[PDB]
Design a protein around this ligand. Structure first.
Ligand SMILES: [Cl-]
Ligand SMILES: [Cl-]
Ligand SMILES: [Cl-]
Ligand SMILES: [Cl-]
Lengths: 194, 194, 195
């Protein structure tokens, strides 16, 4: 005495109502509908950069950070606005809880497309479950200030674990100018979203 | 009488059939299922690059543009093919309606993974609701022509509002070559997709 | 009826039909099944299974981790190249894909979900066109390094072509007496709709 419209279906052989879905796109997790490849973003809140410090120097920066998870890849993006003109190599460090992923350096939130914070443990940014990782490299960056070019240079990134916690360490190299730049890179997480 | 298979569920107490879903991945909007963090792309159509003028000069380029919404983040990508060799700095300006997000400089469309145009108003590219934004920086770029390296240089980006509309302004700097390059950067939108 | 439905399920008394209400710019129905309008699919080298590449006829190899991420109709290509041999000149790193199916012919790649599971999906979503043509090329700035030390600020070209029925992504890095060790990404468009 009732009908079902696709993607709902009714099996008369077992009197059961189902939702049909494409398994490469959607899935069931603990009985609830979910995506196979959700976009999760771990980020500094809007207008709420985190304070970063160049090692033990009295040199600081505001950083806006987004860590965008697609499939098992993380796209890491940072916008760094250093306060102090410097010559040399600055070391910027981001520390994350090695079990939960929680940023210990500064305030980060898992933020949906809605603009609302999501109740998601941020394990999805951790490179390995075993707390072992080799990943490092360099990206080209351009330092500027107030819309004026200052320098074409580079920034290293390195992913490590120390004392059980996950670290992303960035080293910018400057000559005379404030370390003010945006850079991104990608890395892989072995932590499945399930 | 009838049964439900997960992710459908039946509560015998209140005689109600529901769809169970993971709130960080899916949500309900106006009674309809939606994604918490949908991917939307606002782009120039395939084979319909946008013609851009270099400021008040009589010089032009064609550009393919994609603006990808990930969570609240926007990944802006442009591929610029300039016509004219130059030594100096070129200004490429994109204007968007400050309320709708619609590109006023030339044709852009919201394009689904299906390859069909979507009937979505592109507010999701706008940085703020109160028409305030500070975001600028520079990216390293390489100018080339027909597969040959020409110059390693840089391009600024700046996000502004003027007279109620949203602007992305790019400034490429060249020494003799045509401005032909690809660049990308990320910025944040305060406009929740709800 | 004797039952109720909670949104996003709805019941039309008029026709005695239970339906799912969904936002069509985000979700759709394909072959009677729920799907996404713009799903993320990633074609990639497997975890800890980098692809071995040779530079042309030279006795010069690199290991490459590759991800090709599909959103909407755009593909974000990312490669991490770890060259074994110091060199001066321009290296060619060539990736070939079946021009109809998209499968990587040069080495092992898999469509990988967010779950960490391989997905049973033909990788046609990386192909620029059904009609086996494409013009897309450019250069990206790169920085070569080794063991955390800066070596060189340089560049890498990319070019998308078809030859003899197959799709090629060809990268050429230019080095001056360092190992070609760098990461680069670029974006291109696919005209293959995911349906
Ligand atoms: Cl599918
Ligand atoms: Cl939530
Ligand atoms: Cl979840
Ligand atoms: Cl929508």
């Amino acid at each position: 005495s009732f009908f079902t419209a696709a993607p709902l279906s009714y099996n008369t052989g077992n009197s059961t109502i189902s939702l049909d879905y494409r398994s490469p796109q959607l899935r069931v997790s603990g009985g609830a509908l979910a995506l196979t490849s959700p976009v999760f973003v771990y980020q500094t809140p809007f207008n709420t950069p985190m304070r970063l410090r160049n090692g033990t120097y009295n040199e600081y920066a505001d950083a806006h950070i987004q860590m965008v998870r697609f499939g098992t890849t993380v796209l890491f993006n940072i916008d760094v606005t250093g306060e102090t003109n410097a010559t040399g190599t600055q070391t910027w460090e981001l520390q994350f809880d090695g079990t939960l992923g929680s940023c210990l350096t500064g305030r980060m939130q898992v933020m949906g497309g809605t603009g609302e914070e999501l109740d998601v443990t941020p394990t999805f940014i951790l490179p390995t479950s075993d707390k072992s990782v080799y990943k490092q490299g360099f990206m080209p960056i351009v330092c500027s200030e107030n819309g004026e070019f200052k320098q074409s240079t580079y920034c290293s990134y390195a992913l490590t674990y120390r004392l059980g916690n996950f670290y992303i360490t960035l080293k910018s190299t400057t000559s005379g100018c404030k370390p003010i730049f945006q850079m991104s890179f990608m890395y892989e997480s072995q932590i499945g979203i399930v």
